[PDB]
Design a binder for this molecule. Structure first.
Ligand SMILES: Cc1cn([C@H]2C[C@H](O)[C@@H](COP(=O)(O)OP(=O)(O)OP(=O)(O)O)O2)c(=O)[nH]c1=O
Ligand SMILES: Cc1cn([C@H]2C[C@H](O)[C@@H](COP(=O)(O)OP(=O)(O)OP(=O)(O)O)O2)c(=O)[nH]c1=O
Ligand SMILES: [Mg+2]
Ligand SMILES: [Mg+2]
Ligand SMILES: [Mn+2]
Ligand SMILES: [Mn+2]
Ligand SMILES: [Mn+2]
Ligand SMILES: [Mn+2]
Lengths: 762, 713
DNA sequence: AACGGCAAATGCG
DNA sequence: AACGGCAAATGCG
DNA sequence: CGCATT
DNA sequence: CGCATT
């Protein structure tokens, strides 16, 4: 299989290098004949004589057009003849493309900003990560000596740990007596030993957790200080640190540096992305965190260094385990997009779609449209109508089914041939007209993007069938992320039509997809209510919750399956409504906010959690009891007795002050805050008192009754005393308990006045 | 008359500038001898040799202590000897004060954060705005070209309008044919013409409405783009834009930039503070609003520019008229506090109290306590018991008198000598002990704050006497705001004791004032009920509504006057209960919520009416009829027949849809109906909405007191 | 700009 | 590195 | 405006 | 809390 491609320059000419692993052997193949080029559309063919003579400069070197070739291509399916302008070196292109575009005889230029190594993979039809080749993997982590107020990598690396299928080891330059610890004389010998381990093991994949921004840069500064050639690359090169957006990315030539951080960050939704939080979220097992301040104290005092070495060993061990689980998903994405694993694992969804389209356009002899200029970008900022969100039905409902369209927007694109090359194309025998917006789409030939979505949907469904049939819950969770990645990718082709920077931008296509979606959902709602006696409780874009008011579970399931057979027979092409779930009870508060309970007693809440906001244990506990009373017990009157009980106890000062602690994290330096909330106000006072506040510190505070605003009175819970200080009962009622439970009890007709304590007169 | 003070630096030394207007002539007086200083309390006098040698740095400049002087002062009435540490420049103080405080021989430092120019006004005994000097005033406004999604001042100023006693004019760079419009060639010539107008007129006061945050900053960016020296200051300086908390404030040196916005914002309570809303609230006359989008379209198309010029002219005209009315109040406040009009018009009530106390402390050789640090601020957030609020007696009551104490909390402070310097002071022959909280206050000598409140109460009563005898309702309304500002100022000395940032903070003093107030009101209630046979219906802090159940108007008034004579003879010092009003009928719903009607048929409602944007005429009209039936007719059964009549008519679609109207640009009123050009022959209004969300919520809050719930209505 | 986010508690919704 | 932005709208708070 | 739900 | 009444 092909792992990656790049290019080097030999005598001013580029040489493509293809990094491969074939039959367990690493190989580098060289192509010295592939030439860079761009296209030019001219107003007249005779002007090519003047265009061939255009020159530019590139550090003393005169840049010239090597040769030209008139080629017949297509632009949005319409034939167009352009001139393929060849160059000696890819860096000639940025130096001369503006001068060629500015020539009076040149109407426009195309495919001028495609990186040379990626252009090679596309033009040669090569796809990375193909085949039954087994890759050797090795994860690594570093433990460093940190002291606040110091420059980056000023302190030494204390330990370098690594892990693979054979186990995990730690290299350190202090005498720690553990079986997996290798003790060396100095930091220099430790780095040299790690470099030796990677050369001996010769891994195809180097796994890190944030190695793109921390591990490699730290190793680089330490190697520069110690005079060590950190030759990790298979061709003797050192790691190549490049700028990627607002951060950095690191390559190790001949190997795949798989940094798990960007992959995990876009795959799983978590409040924190520490290696410990990621490991527990995936494997359901805890990982102990040993902080930087503890590592430094253990090193300087010599005490408890076994705990630091164990923490370091487990960093490498869990990074290897996480790498094993997430690599198959990324390797499949590399095959789909047709680009290296290093690229697809770090690139945005917009870039994945664009790289996939550039390849398919090449296969189909289609000229790629250019990225918009500043003027065109300003023209593409207008929005369009999206999905339909029904206002939910107030009240408690029983025996509810959730029906949802399978891959709605991609199925609409395939069925109705929604593409920029089919939009208002004259001369066709057949058209599909988008409702409301009226855009017409030619149906005589498959459109560019519609013809490509089918295979993605087929691939996703194969993964879903594998998933539902998986015994292992970890493997099933990873297959769930895999099918969801393809689901998000397929939907991003729709989004891409309305994305201002898209090459194949088509706002008409985007608003037609949403218009057809709005038509299908509203028609389906009308159909289930009028033909089958269902009541649609709530709907959002392509799915809805419905029930037959006076019917048992067996009847509602039976009639939902009858409706699905009926509606699926009426729906055209790839459009299909699926049975997604059954819920015993369910309440629908507002749009995007509701809670449902399945037959196994599992509650699913959407828009109700709101965990980023500041919540007290009393508000969390009250909302938990309210939802338990409504969904589990089916008793709305009990839920309102709980809220009235809590507000009465808060007013009477009967609630233990332990339930009033608000915990919220400090996420940056205290000086870097724009707005000062209660948690920041407490933290600034604690910092002034000598307490070390750092990003990650949780502030546990309580609001007392007093003079100033919330943050002014707010104090740490370690300073509160119920025998001296009276808590702010009104705050816990009006700002914590009531806002959280009112949004739920709105559905049953209860307002804030009904939830508050009686205040009876004597 | 002193308008303002500031300082400049000449050869590293400060020079105070006093901006004056004497006999119609503007003058600048200079003081080159006033020195900055702070105080240090040392553990031993010999350590002054080490303290004198402390140095700091200030951009390459070595900061040193110029000289020291041992001075005898008082800290909370107790003699304390401190060292007055003098410096060359006021900016030396922030650079070296922490190093002096951190010295092991220094116990504490004082008066280290007083701005130099304000320190000068205090130490010299100078008070701004004194005398019968007449000030020349000029208001101004600007009309700009706005386009959404652009940076601040990216578009030009289209018109600059100004107004004074001689009239209002508009300078613009487009040919508009109006008598008051002066047409110039460019935006540059318009700004230069405006600068010329202000230099020629030479006004003492420049009036704006939000000029601190919009007008001056817009002019600044446009002048920087056009290369114009905007020398508005009398010394040739440009407007000085400074940060004041979360907003900005602008000075024009030698003149008083009077921005009406902060003054109006704290004086009048309104849902919106647009210039149009403020003008109608004060003068009772409407002002048309021409929006930014209309101004831009008029300018780009050339159509209807007369309407824009008229709007611009009226902005300057009404800002001048409002400025004339609000300047006397602010000029008097400047004399009371002893600080410039620019400062007193923009500072909070707590800063006015503090600047007044800093001046009085200087006069009395009293060291000012320091403001608290973050740790001390956190220690002062504990609350204390406030006023007493009696649960009201439900039902409709007749022939009710309202008796209320005159300046309660300030009178308690004066009578019982409630002050931080008299609190638990040992050695006195006489004390007053606060009830419940038990704090003792020495009575042998007048306390600092108690000795200052008497003159404020005297001043307020002089304004009240003038007010009640004023024929003009506008002048009477302005005097009402003036006496109320002194009433709130006097009550803020009490609040100041319990204010965490206060220098003269004393929570014991604050809770003793409230404790004495709770004792006087509950004692008075017990006294009127047990001795005079009255029934106290409702009470809040220092006043109560009472009646003699089976008595006519003449009897209740007569017996209330007899009780006042009796109770006033028992009350000590400055404590006095006043006859504040008589009401034919009154209904008391909950605490802070009730409605009373006087003999002239005027209804006063507290806590009942709301400033909500959703006012349907049917809900307002129904609530008006309900209150009229309860207070005028004394018939609860009629009020409930009215609500049942309205809900029945709404259900039957008999109410005209004009009574159901509820009423993006800031200030735009939306007039809508729940189902603008509604048609009863096609559309049916939401009867249930007008019953359950408009009529019932408004009238139920009132009919609750008589036992009626939403189901009965 | 140096001093300015802050006068207090009680109570309803 | 030469490419690289971070696929879309609806809706609550 | 950010984040959550599609 | 937010705003109104003291
Ligand atoms: C989740 C999601 C939805 N949408 C749009 C397109 C989807 O077709 C539509 C409905 O959302 P979904 O029901 O979440 O997605 P889906 O129909 O594509 O997939 P599935 O078979 O699992 O139901 O909302 C996006 O544009 N982007 C997204 O990431
Ligand atoms: C109005 C008001 C009252 N209070 C306190 C102190 C007052 O003395 C007490 C009673 O309020 P008021 O009766 O409104 O005020 P007053 O007694 O000072 O003045 P008047 O002679 O007009 O009756 O409530 C404040 O602390 N701040 C205020 O702004
Ligand atoms: Mg869905
Ligand atoms: Mg009163
Ligand atoms: Mn689905
Ligand atoms: Mn779907
Ligand atoms: Mn009074
Ligand atoms: Mn009073």
């Amino acid at each position: 299989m092909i792992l990656d491609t790049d290019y080097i320059t030999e005598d001013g000419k580029p040489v493509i290098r293809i990094f491969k692993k074939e039959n367990g052997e690493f190989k580098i193949d060289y192509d010295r004949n592939f030439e860079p080029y761009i296209y030019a559309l001219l107003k007249d063919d005779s002007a090519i004589e003047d265009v061939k003579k255009i020159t530019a400069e590139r550090h003393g070197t005169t840049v010239r057009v090597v040769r030209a070739e008139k080629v017949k291509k297509k632009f949005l399916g319409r034939p167009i003849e352009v001139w393929k302008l060849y160059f000696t070196h890819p860096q000639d292109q940025p130096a001369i493309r503006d001068k060629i575009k500015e020539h009076p005889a040149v109407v426009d230029i195309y495919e001028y900003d495609i990186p040379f190594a990626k252009r090679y993979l596309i033009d040669k039809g090569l796809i990375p990560m193909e085949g039954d080749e087994e890759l050797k993997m090795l994860a690594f982590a570093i433990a460093t000596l940190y002291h606040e107020g110091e420059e980056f990598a000023e302190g030494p690396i204390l330990m370098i740990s690594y892990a693979d299928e054979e186990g995990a080891r730690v290299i350190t330059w202090k005498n720690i007596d553990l079986p997996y610890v290798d003790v060396v004389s100095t930091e220099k010998e430790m780095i040299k030993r790690f470099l030796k381990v990677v050369k001996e093991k010769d891994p195809d994949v180097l796994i890190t957790y944030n190695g793109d921004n921390f591990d490699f840069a730290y190793l680089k500064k330490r190697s520069e200080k110690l005079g060590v050639k950190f030759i990790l690359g298979r061709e003797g090169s050192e790691p190549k640190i490049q700028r990627m957006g607002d951060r950095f990315a690191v390559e190790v030539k001949g190997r795949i540096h798989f940094d798990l951080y960007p992959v995990i960050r876009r795959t799983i939704n978590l409040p924190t992305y520490t290696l410990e939080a990621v490991y527990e979220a995936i494997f359901g097992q805890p990982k102990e965190k040993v902080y930087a301040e503890e590592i430094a104290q253990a090193w300087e005092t010599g005490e408890g260094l076994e705990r630091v070495a164990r923490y370091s060993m487990e960093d490498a061990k869990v990074t290897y385990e996480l790498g094993k689980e997430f690599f198959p998903m990324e390797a499949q994405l590399s095959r789909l997009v047709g680009q290296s694993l290093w690229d697809v694992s770090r690139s945005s969804t917009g870039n994945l779609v664009e790289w996939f389209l550039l390849r398919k356009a090449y296969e189909r002899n289609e000229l790629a449209p250019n990225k918009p200029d500043e003027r065109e970008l300003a023209r593409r900022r207008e929005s369009y109508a999206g999905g339909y969100v029904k206002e939910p039905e107030r009240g408690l409902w029983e025996n509810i089914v959730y029906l949802d369209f399978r891959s709605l927007y991609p199925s609409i694109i395939i069925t109705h041939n929604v593409s920029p090359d089919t939009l208002n194309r004259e001369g066709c025998e057949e058209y599909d007209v988008a409702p409301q917006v009226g855009h017409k789409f030619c149906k005589d030939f498959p459109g560019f993007i519609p013809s490509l979505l089918g295979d993605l949907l087929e691939e996703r469904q194969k993964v879903k069938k594998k998933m539902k049939a998986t015994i292992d819950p970890i493997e099933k969770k990873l297959l769930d992320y895999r099918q969801r990645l393809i689901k998000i990718l397929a939907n991003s082709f729709y989004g891409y039509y309305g994305y201002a920077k898209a090459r194949w931008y088509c706002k008409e296509c985007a608003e037609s997809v949403t218009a057809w979606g709005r038509q299908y959902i509203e028609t389906t709602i009308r159909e289930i209510e009028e033909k089958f006696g269902f009541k649609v409780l709530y709907a959002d874009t392509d799915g809805f919750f419905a029930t037959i008011p006076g019917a048992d579970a067996e009847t509602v399931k039976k009639k939902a399956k009858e409706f699905l057979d009926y509606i699926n027979a009426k729906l055209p092409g790839l459009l299909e409504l699926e049975y997604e779930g059954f819920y015993k009870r369910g309440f629908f508060a507002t749009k995007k906010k509701y809670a449902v309970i399945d037959e196994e007693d599992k509650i699913t809440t959407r828009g109700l959690k709101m965990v980023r906001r500041d919540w007290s244990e009393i508000a969390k506990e009250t909302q938990a009891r309210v939802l338990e009373a409504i969904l589990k017990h089916g008793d709305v009157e009990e839920a309102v007795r709980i809220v009235k009980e809590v507000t009465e106890k808060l007013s009477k000062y009967e609630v233990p002050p332990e339930q009033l602690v608000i915990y919220q994290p400090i996420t940056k330096q205290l000086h870097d805050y724009r707005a000062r909330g209660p948690h920041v106000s407490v933290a600034k006072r604690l910092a002034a008192r000598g307490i070390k506040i750092r990003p990650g510190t949780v502030i546990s505070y309580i609001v007392p009754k007093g003079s100033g605003r919330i943050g002014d009175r707010a104090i740490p819970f370690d300073e509160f005393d119920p025998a001296k200080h009276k808590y702010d009962a009104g705050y816990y009622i009006e700002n914590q308990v009531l806002p959280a439970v009112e949004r739920i009890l709105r559905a049953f007709g209860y307002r804030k006045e009904d939830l508050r304590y009686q205040k009876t007169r004597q």
